[PDB]
Design a binder for this molecule. Structure first.
Ligand SMILES: [Mg+2]
Ligand SMILES: [Mg+2]
Lengths: 296, 296, 296, 296
């Protein structure tokens, strides 16, 4: 199977005067490349995919594809939806635009069954011939992709190569890699990046890496090289920022942190997302003081 | 405040050959009207709102509005989204089409904070001049509209007149009506229709009423007339079907039941929703046999 | 079946200088009787059963039995355990000491299966010839008595006449009384006292009644007399104190309130129970303010 | 600090004719010693502590101490309670009987606060001069020992040296060892033995090791020697038996498995524990077929 693994960043989407700040976006992606990131994830959850228009969806993928050309950095585009017909369209959309692969979140709100999840992803995988990474995050979607369903999709659809787990469930990560050790388990939960990698996970799709890409990059590759003491030390070091970056719903804290570090121009969200509380704004500001944040 | 209360039905959306069975849709609404229902809710969760096109959304609202024209039956149209700018558009859209009001689900997946939920619904309420009913279903959305946020929105916005609760939390229903007794609490969970009504709830948005509209309407009206013994008696009789209609994710069982009862011609869903398992197919069929199902 | 229903109080156990204040205990029980209570529950959870000696267990049961002589108030003694042989011993112990019935909590910590729970209660029920009330509180025990197991015990065991439910699950309360309407459902959660009674529950085992016995008694008796409007008015008025009495684990807040109202002499617990935070002490004091607290 | 770490077994307590089979108990302990186990845990949860008499508690402890004399195997005695005064007595009781340390479960059922948990364990730690390992298992106790409380207890009481975690929460295990790397994190969940060890945990208190002590011992010591690839291979292979051993509440499955392998004579529990269902009996028998089970 063709795969996209290693240290990866779920890109935030900076807004300026309510529109996508394109200059910014490209500059942020180049900053990721220059700090050892292996792939970037445009218009994912952290990029506020829910509140972007389809044309802004096209714009950010194209910018990501164009910025990583000539580099080893891959573009893993967010291309999921809770209606299979649209998810297939967004996948073909993502491929047509040069994405190296797609991250396709489990259908949200409408709670498909495991049989439905299988047919959903089976349709997406047969739509394009680029790698497909499943994304399981039940706290947001209301559904869970079972280990059996993930394994069946991995074995039945050739371009489905793994799953990004955001479920706080190291039991499930043992289950997945013990029964199907060929799949690429991807950490979608920054605080537990190292434990997932230490059990055979092959990368992270990180929120923290927006702010500290060099540290998330070093952690991942230490782990992939089985230097577990070095990876665990960074994982331990980063725990405080990993937790405070979810003081409020992601991506509210990470965008607040990026603004505090002068990496984005304005702290703008699209409703129903909003700026954090003032207590949290200060809490985020206090944790950042203990880390070294790379510039441009 | 202008309100829409009483026995209400979250209408299923029948498909035939992948298209909205428009004639069936109209016939199903007439069956609701003739069995004492007070309002119908087109293109809600039970209507597979997530997988309908915006023009199919329009068609079902228009069919619902005209089918109830000349009757007292009201149309509470589904018009929610997790992107505020889209939720405002669907609200004005629903008004334009003749809806008496809108049911607006809490933003799903992107987990807005309480501040964001407040701004989300305040933008929606200021979009139109028709009643707005909040819809709290945390198991689907990943977020909760707190009691304080519901009460604040009720007091600040003219058209926000209550909440449809589907959270299995009778405590919160006491919290809501004890601190704001003027609001319209609406049951969105058929099994506990009577306990919510007996505490001062003023209606139901029902899944079971698709199959048994006369039973759900009588239950609601017994309750509103303070004949709690008769409303509880129907609620107790309905428990078995109320539960089995969620053996799998709603609306997979209710559509199965409508097809088994010969009320729709084909048991078609739009992916990622699919037919139920064969064991649950048998369970729905067996529970249905103990209830009298009205024809057309 | 012989039953013990109505307004009932889970009695706190006052300590003075590390010993049971037996005269304060007596004063408290007499205060309960004179405010319309139908039964008292000595050495339950609210009475810190876990940290009392078996000899102090006897003292409090006997004091309760002696204090209720000449009145209609029954003694439903706490006599449960997670070891079946001990729970049977405590049951015979309770009868031998004059209790009218026993409240028997579901085995805690060791998580028996449904088959094990049935055999547990079947052994207890055959040990004595006084009424036995099941107590389901999964947040404390780690186990749940399923509706089927409760029903089986009610139908198979003569002294098992109902269940005290403290599970925040109004669905289960419908489930129970719809399939076995002859059983006595007793609310063990003060905040949802009225909805449980309105669904056919026949009493409450209350924490709040320690502080506000007249209000809990009136609520219950209005409800039993089918005066649902008055029962709901009291339930809504009590919501604030009903919630704050669980700001920390019961009985920490209720004892703090009993001390604040001058009803007990010392704010003493037995470890691992301790005084509340200084903020929760403050909140309890504020909330307490809004209610008229009967003296002796 | 003096510590007890490595591969450890939560010993089952075999019964024959309702009596502790003391002679099988000794035979089972010697089997653990001879298969590389570093410490044994008498009268814990897996040992059905709740249903043993205090005289059987002392008897099983003395057998454990006597069998491990002249060997490197330590006895970490179960000596916990939800009443601090009894837990202090049980601690003294354990020292008196020769135990090398105690495993002391968080108070169950009565849900003490963090402040109460602190004073509870501080009294126990100051009760004796032998190592104390905290035991956090919220699914059984109803309470959680927070990271802050564990850390405070570790720093303030010299004989408290770590915590056995049974909470399925790899985030918390990162939290613990990132903020206090000197403590001994011990796995209390067999399926995730490797991830806990790979993050710096120094041992396991295992259920599976009852049946496969050689495999659990090799797992732990591959891990302690940083041969993580070999430790992960054993963990992955044990996953199926690790999960099936909790098909029903522990220790019902492990005793069923021990009985199926001919390692104990009678499939006897003390109520409320009981034999498993016949479907789970068949499931346990089927998963066992894939492992080499060492005899006597
Ligand atoms: Mg290298
Ligand atoms: Mg192996």
């Amino acid at each position: 199977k063709n795969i996209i693994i290693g240290a990866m960043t779920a890109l935030i989407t900076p807004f300026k005067n309510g529109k996508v700040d394109e200059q910014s976006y490209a500059r942020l992606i180049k900053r990721q490349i220059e700090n050892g990131i292996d792939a970037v994830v445009p218009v994912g959850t952290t990029g506020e995919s829910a509140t972007l228009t389809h044309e802004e969806h096209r714009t950010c993928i194209e910018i990501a594809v164009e910025t990583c050309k000539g580099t080893k950095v891959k573009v893993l585009a967010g291309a999921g939806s809770n209606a299979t017909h649209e998810a297939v369209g967004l996948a073909k959309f993502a491929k047509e635009h040069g994405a190296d692969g797609i991250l396709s979140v489990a259908p949200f709100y409408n709670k498909p069954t495991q049989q439905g999840l299988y047919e959903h992803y089976k349709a997406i995988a047969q739509s394009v011939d680029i790698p497909v990474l499943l994304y399981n995050v039940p706290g947001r979607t209301g559904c869970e992709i079972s280990t059996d369903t993930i394994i069946k999709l991995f074995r039945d659809c050739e371009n489905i190569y793994g799953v990004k787990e955001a479920s706080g469930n190291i039991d499930k990560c043992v289950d997945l890699l013990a029964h199907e050790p060929r799949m690429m388990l991807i950490s979608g939960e920054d605080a537990i990046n190292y434990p997932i990698l230490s059990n055979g996970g092959k990368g992270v799709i990180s929120v923290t890496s927006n702010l500290l890409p060099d540290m998330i990059s070093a952690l991942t590759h230490f782990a992939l090289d089985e230097n577990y003491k070095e990876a665990k030390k960074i994982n331990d070091e980063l725990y405080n920022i990993n937790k405070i970056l979810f003081c409020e719903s992601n991506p509210i804290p990470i965008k607040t942190a990026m603004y505090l570090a002068g990496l984005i121009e304005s702290l703008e969200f699209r409703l129903p997302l909003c700026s954090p509380s003032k207590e949290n704004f200060a809490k985020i500001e206090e944790v950042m003081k203990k880390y070294k944040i790379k510039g441009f």
